[PDB]
């Protein structure tokens, strides 16, 4: 669930998802269209693609099982659909950390989703 997502982002990034990643580029946060603007924005696009594939559970609302083992986030439990969610979340948290070096709030924070009106990329 979203509470969990925030936890993983904080863990991997040191940053709050709600502050840093809820309104960045064309895809990070609520809504998303057009093409991702940067590496970070791409992490978000892929996240949305990742949720889009989840069938038989709710990737925003359901609670998945995870443990932190020597810095690593391991996706457990026995429900395959919940594990899928865990996998989506963790993959976006790792993708934000890989890309912290090009994170640009000055250009991309509060980007007007209106400037995202050109041929979308397929998942």
Residues 6+ apart with CB under 8 A from 6: 16, 17, 18
Query: Which experiment gave this structure?
Result: X-ray
H helices of 1-123, in order, are 2-13, 17-20, 39-52, 80-98, 105-108
CA distances for 43 relative to 21, 24, 56, 78, angstroms: 10, 11, 24, 27
- Kind of pairing, strands 28-29 and 23-24? antiparallel
Active site residues: 47, 89
Residues 27, 35 contacting (CB under 8 angstroms): no
Residue 108 annotated as binding site: no
Half-sphere exposure of 28 (CA within 13 A, CB side): 28
Structural domains of the chain ordered from first start: 1-123 (1.20.90.10)
Residue 31 assigned as binding residue: yes
Planar angle of CA 115, 100, 22, nearest 5 degrees: 50
């Amino acid at each position: 669930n979203l509470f969990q997502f925030e936890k993983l982002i904080k863990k991997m990034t040191g940053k709050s998802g709600m502050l840093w990643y809820s309104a960045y580029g064309c895809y990070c946060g609520w809504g998303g269209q057009g093409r991702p603007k940067d590496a970070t924005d791409r992490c978000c696009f892929v996240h949305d693609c990742c949720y889009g594939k989840v069938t038989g559970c709710n990737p925003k609302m359901d609670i998945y099982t995870y443990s932190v083992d020597n810095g690593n986030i391991v996706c457990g439990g026995t429900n395959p659909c919940k594990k899928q969610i865990c996998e989506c979340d963790r993959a976006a948290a790792i993708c934000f950390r890989d890309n912290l070096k090009t994170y640009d709030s000055k250009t991309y924070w509060k980007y007007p989703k209106k400037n995202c009106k050109e041929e979308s990329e397929p998942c």
